[PDB]
Design a protein around this nucleic acid. Structure first.
Ligand SMILES: [Mg+2]
Ligand SMILES: [Mg+2]
Ligand SMILES: [Mg+2]
Ligand SMILES: [Mg+2]
Ligand SMILES: [Mg+2]
Ligand SMILES: [Mg+2]
Ligand SMILES: [Mg+2]
Ligand SMILES: [Mg+2]
Ligand SMILES: [Mg+2]
Ligand SMILES: [Mg+2]
Ligand SMILES: [Mg+2]
Ligand SMILES: [Mg+2]
Ligand SMILES: [Mg+2]
Ligand SMILES: [Mg+2]
Ligand SMILES: [Mg+2]
Ligand SMILES: [Mg+2]
Ligand SMILES: [Mg+2]
Ligand SMILES: [Mg+2]
Ligand SMILES: [Mg+2]
Ligand SMILES: [Mg+2]
Ligand SMILES: [Mg+2]
Ligand SMILES: [Mg+2]
Ligand SMILES: [Mg+2]
Ligand SMILES: [Mg+2]
Ligand SMILES: [Mg+2]
Ligand SMILES: [Mg+2]
Ligand SMILES: [Mg+2]
Ligand SMILES: [Mg+2]
Ligand SMILES: [Mg+2]
Ligand SMILES: [Mg+2]
Ligand SMILES: [Mg+2]
Ligand SMILES: [Mg+2]
Ligand SMILES: [Mg+2]
Ligand SMILES: [Mg+2]
Lengths: 50, 205, 151, 262
RNA sequence: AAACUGCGAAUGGCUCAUUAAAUCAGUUAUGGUUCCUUUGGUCGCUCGUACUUGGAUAACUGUGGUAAUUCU
RNA sequence: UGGUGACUCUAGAUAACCUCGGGCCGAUCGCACGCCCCCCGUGGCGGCGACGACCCAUUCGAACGUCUGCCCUAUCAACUUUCGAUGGUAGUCGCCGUGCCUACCAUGGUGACCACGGGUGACGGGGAAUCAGGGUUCGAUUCCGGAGAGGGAGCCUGAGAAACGGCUACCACAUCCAAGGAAGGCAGCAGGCGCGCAAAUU
RNA sequence: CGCUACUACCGAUUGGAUGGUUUAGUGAGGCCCUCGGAUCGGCCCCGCCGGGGUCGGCCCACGGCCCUGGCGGAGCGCUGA
């Protein structure tokens, strides 16, 4: 499972490859345009909303 | 789809004919616009040549004309009472050309009372409201009263129309095609035609 | 009464019969003004059309039709449909090889107006072309002339 | 077909263009315009086949895109523009003026005219109708619509139009004794005087015409164009005055011309 | 250049399977219809921010998916 | 007012209506640039074109109708009408006229002058071969009409298509595949297989 | 009548076959109608950043009334697609 993350304020994109079920649990059973808290990704994303 | 050609029909002698070409675009047909009574809903149809047809699906008002008085007014449509082509159209309350409907009488009553200055559609109990009293019993000068009194010579209406005005609803006939132009216009029934349709309605019951 | 035989009211569309009038003019006569027209080409309007009271939208004289095209003639053979008859047209077809002719006929279904009465089988009819009135009818009866045995 | 056609086979072209068979498979299809396809002359045919100015269709375009050709006083750059009867063609570069008039053989002729004559044309009234606000309108044979015409002008009459302003100067009534030209049929290109008119209600009318030499013929009413009042034409006529010769006397004239040549 | 917009792509070319008052030919009618385009006529005829109004989308720049497409 | 052989024509008057899936009544572009005022400005005016647009007329048409006309076959003599066959009334649908369709009605319509059915190694004409005068046979084929795009059917866009070098399914074939999917239509020009007595260059 | 061969006829019976019709029962797909509402906006209610005027106590501070550019959160409030 790859994640293509875009920051519009800077307009910078980055592709990150994630091999972990725990990090992807919070995204399952979600529809498009929904707001999620990306805390499970790691320690860098504390307070980020995706 | 729906085709209204002539080559699928039998010959005059009675023999059947084999077609020589398939269905063409210019021979098409479209499903009927079964116009009901309700809040206005009209759909436009792109037709041959790039023109438009207004497909009325729901209508509740239309302008009808009182021919004898030459008074055309916009009035709401209440119910469908008679249909010459089929009685199923009456049961489903479908608005088509030449169907007999019931319309409100208030604008015609207002025009009659403002023109001839005579009561119309009022009960014998003579209950009144000051606005109507000042409409009928206004203070006019000699010249204006002379015109109104002369108009009162021709102020006479048949008993059938008077009874319909007492009931509050008039019988009218639709002269436009709602499924083609999107509006339901017509005229108020009166004379021998009114008697004919009253007899038909009574015999239907 | 006799005219009103359908579920719908039978009226001449171009005549307004609800014009209100004084009580003195109502007593005189309830005589509707008749609508009729001259069809042209030298044909005269039958007096039964002008003075009649029938309603026929396909009548050449009191209806909404236009006569343009070919003017043909025939003999009345059948009168069994409502306001339309069947006439027969006879002719000779030439065969080049034998320098001779053969007898042929055609049948036409034409519209007959109520203004024409006392029309019998075997009398001559002059018809004119109009727009298609039905699946098989394209002509309207314009003149009727009786047979040679008329007394 | 599923729509309008855009080509024209060379053998199916009108025979008064006098195209040859072996040049190509196609012929210039006239554009839509004032005149009918079968009763017009395309600009390319007149510009390369009649006048020999151009050799190919490319040179006709090169001439037209320099805005040298004017038709009825207006510059036309289309090479297939339909030019028809009683039209004026002006070339200011060479200072030449032409008027499209049928010859006695039923073909458009190269007829040069004075620059003074090139300021007007004759038109045949095709329709008279009253429009909105009760304004009369007159429609001619070349699709011109003119408002407020003279009340005495009816159909089948002739009007003189000044090409600069496009307004009627005078008119000729359709009466016996006037001068007319035939614009269609077997007598196309003939000139004569109207003798009588036969009226057929519901059908076509027939008009009888007699020429200067006394030969009589007949046409339909739609094929007659009134040129002048009485015996005097209002336009200049081509080399032949409209008198059609028989084959015997054409042969006699040709032999006489050959004998006197040399 | 690319891309948005406009137009054309219903013409042309091929074949003769179907089809026997059907197609087709001559002759008439549309006063019973539609008509891109060309040509001409109308386009202050209505009595009720304007010194120019609004939000987006390509081409472009960057991040990608699929064995595979004029996919996105 | 004006016109036709003929209007329920065109034009005029009056009372209203005027669809949010909404008729018009210009928020567009180029080239030359100048005349005027108590003026230097909110400066006012002006010439040729290009594009667009409601509605008439015209041009190119298209689509429905009228009359006459086609090869063999009776070992095909009655056919059509339940599911429209013939006509009438009112509607629906259609760009319009009409059993085109619907409802209610009448019993009609065609046929030894060959209806109805069947066959055709039948697209129809302009034409071709042979021919004293009559006639017999041919016309797939460059021009004019029609039809079709493997067989049916249904549509989007558009002024115009029931379009196939457009789309969507079913029927018959058939291409790539990592088996999850994706893509098809030479009766256009060449060319290939098959078929056959029988027909050319990628 | 006895030899030698061919074509055309009947007719135990059922196969390889296709083609064309229809009775009934299902029926893809488009189109029309009645619903449906993933999602995307605009208008109101607050808050803090910013520019034009004016009003008030007034002296380079801060509020009132309107507008105006952005940003964050509510209301199953309203409306349009
Ligand atoms: Mg076919
Ligand atoms: Mg002979
Ligand atoms: Mg073609
Ligand atoms: Mg051309
Ligand atoms: Mg493009
Ligand atoms: Mg196009
Ligand atoms: Mg070729
Ligand atoms: Mg014909
Ligand atoms: Mg029509
Ligand atoms: Mg046009
Ligand atoms: Mg009028
Ligand atoms: Mg009808
Ligand atoms: Mg009927
Ligand atoms: Mg065949
Ligand atoms: Mg043949
Ligand atoms: Mg011979
Ligand atoms: Mg011989
Ligand atoms: Mg041929
Ligand atoms: Mg042929
Ligand atoms: Mg063949
Ligand atoms: Mg052809
Ligand atoms: Mg096709
Ligand atoms: Mg093909
Ligand atoms: Mg094939
Ligand atoms: Mg197919
Ligand atoms: Mg288009
Ligand atoms: Mg197709
Ligand atoms: Mg192809
Ligand atoms: Mg094609
Ligand atoms: Mg090939
Ligand atoms: Mg190929
Ligand atoms: Mg050979
Ligand atoms: Mg070979
Ligand atoms: Mg379905």
């Amino acid at each position: 499972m790859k994640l293509n993350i875009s920051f519009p304020a800077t307009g910078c994109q980055k592709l990150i490859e994630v091999d972990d079920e725990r990090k992807l649990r919070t995204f399952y059973e979600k529809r498009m345009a929904t707001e999620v808290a990306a805390d499970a990704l790691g320690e860098e994303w504390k307070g980020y909303v995706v | 789809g729906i085709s209204r050609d002539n080559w699928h029909k039998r010959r005059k002698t009675g023999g059947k004919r084999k077609p020589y070409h398939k269905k063409r675009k210019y021979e098409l047909g479209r499903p009927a616009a079964n116009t009901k009574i309700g809040p206005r809903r009209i759909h436009t149809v792109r037709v041959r040549g790039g023109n438009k047809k207004y497909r009325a699906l729901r209508l509740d008002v239309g302008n009808f004309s009182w021919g004898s008085e030459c008074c055309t007014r916009k009035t709401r449509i209440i119910d469908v009472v008679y249909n010459a082509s089929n009685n199923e159209l009456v049961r489903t309350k479908t608005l088509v050309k030449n169907c007999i409907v019931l319309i409100d009488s208030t604008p015609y009553r207002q025009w009659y009372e403002s023109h001839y200055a005579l009561p119309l559609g009022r009960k014998k109990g003579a209950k009144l409201t000051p606005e109507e009293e000042e409409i009928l019993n206004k203070k006019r000068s000699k010249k204006i009263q002379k015109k109104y009194d002369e108009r009162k010579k021709n102020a006479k209406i048949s008993s059938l129309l008077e009874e319909q005005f007492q009931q509050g609803k008039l019988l009218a006939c639709i002269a436009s095609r709602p499924g083609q132009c999107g509006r339901a216009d017509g005229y108020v029934l009166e004379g021998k035609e009114l008697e004919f349709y009253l007899r038909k309605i009574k015999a239907r019951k | 009464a006799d005219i009103q035989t359908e579920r719908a009211y039978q009226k001449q569309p171009t005549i307004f019969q609800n014009k209100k009038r004084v009580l003195l003019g109502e007593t005189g006569k309830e005589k509707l003004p008749r609508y009729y027209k001259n069809i042209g080409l030298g044909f005269k309007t039958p007096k039964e059309a002008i003075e009649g009271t029938y309603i026929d939208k396909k009548c050449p004289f009191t209806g909404n039709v236009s006569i343009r095209g070919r003017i043909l003639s025939g003999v009345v053979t059948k009168m069994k449909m409502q306001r339309t008859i069947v006439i027969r047209r006879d002719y000779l077809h030439y065969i080049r090889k034998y320098n001779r002719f053969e007898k042929r006929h055609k049948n036409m279904s034409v519209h007959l107006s109520p203004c024409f009465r006392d029309v019998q089988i075997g009398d001559i009819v002059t018809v004119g072309e109009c727009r298609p009135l039905s699946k098989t009818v394209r002509f309207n009866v314009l003149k009727v002339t009786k047979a040679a045995g008329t007394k | 077909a599923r729509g309008p056609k855009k080509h024209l086979k060379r053998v199916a072209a009108p025979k008064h263009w006098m195209l040859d068979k072996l040049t190509g498979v196609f012929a210039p299809r006239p554009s839509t315009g004032p005149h009918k396809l079968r009763e017009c002359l395309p600009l390319i045919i007149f510009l390369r086949n009649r006048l020999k100015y151009a050799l190919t269709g490319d040179e006709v375009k090169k001439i037209c895109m320099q805005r040298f050709i004017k038709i009825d006083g207006k510059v036309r750059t289309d090479i297939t523009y339909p030019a028809g009867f009683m039209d004026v063609i002006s070339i200011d570069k060479t200072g030449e003026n032409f008027r499209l008039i049928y010859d006695t053989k039923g073909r458009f002729a190269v007829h040069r005219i004075t620059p003074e004559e090139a300021k007007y044309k004759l038109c045949k009234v095709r329709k008279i109708f009253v429009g909105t606000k009760g304004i009369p309108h007159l429609v001619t044979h070349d699709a011109r619509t003119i408002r407020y015409p003279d009340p005495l002008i009816k159909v089948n009459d002739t009007i003189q139009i000044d090409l600069e302003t496009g307004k009627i100067t005078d008119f000729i009534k359709f009466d016996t004794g006037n001068l007319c030209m035939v614009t269609g049929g077997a007598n196309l290109g003939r000139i004569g005087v109207i003798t009588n008119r036969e009226r057929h209600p519901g059908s076509f009318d027939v008009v009888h015409v007699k020429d200067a030499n006394g030969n009589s013929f007949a046409t339909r009413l739609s094929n007659i164009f009134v040129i002048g009042k009485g015996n005097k034409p209002w336009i200049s006529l081509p080399r032949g005055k409209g008198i059609r010769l028989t084959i015997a006397e054409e042969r006699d004239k040709r032999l006489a011309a050959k004998q006197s040549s040399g």
